[PDB]
């Protein structure tokens, strides 16, 4: 179905180690808010709040 381009998923769990980094849960829906300069680190919106995740855990769900 469509959904939001900016709406991701979890790859892998992601704990965060503080400092205004989110933890995620594999499969965990996750809708981006924005990038850092080379767009490796995401501003994220989850469940349970909004924080840095890193790109190589996460992946667009849109095809």
Same mark, same amino acid.
């Given at each position: 179905?469509?959904?939001?381009?900016? $709406?991701? /998923?979890?790859? @892998?769990?992601?704990?965060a180690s503080g400092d205004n980094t989110l933890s995620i849960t594999k499969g965990?829906? $996750?809708? /981006?808010?924005? @990038?850092?300069?080379?767009?490796?680190?995401?501003?994220?919106?989850?469940?349970?709040?909004?924080?840095?995740?890193?790109?190589?855990?996460?992946?667009?769900?849109?095809?």
């Amino acid at each position: 179905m469509e959904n939001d381009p900016n $709406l991701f /998923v979890a790859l @892998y769990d992601f704990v965060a180690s503080g400092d205004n980094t989110l933890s995620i849960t594999k499969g965990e829906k $996750l809708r /981006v808010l924005g @990038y850092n300069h080379n767009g490796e680190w995401c501003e994220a919106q989850t469940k349970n709040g909004q924080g840095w995740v890193p790109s190589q855990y996460i992946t667009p769900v849109n095809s």
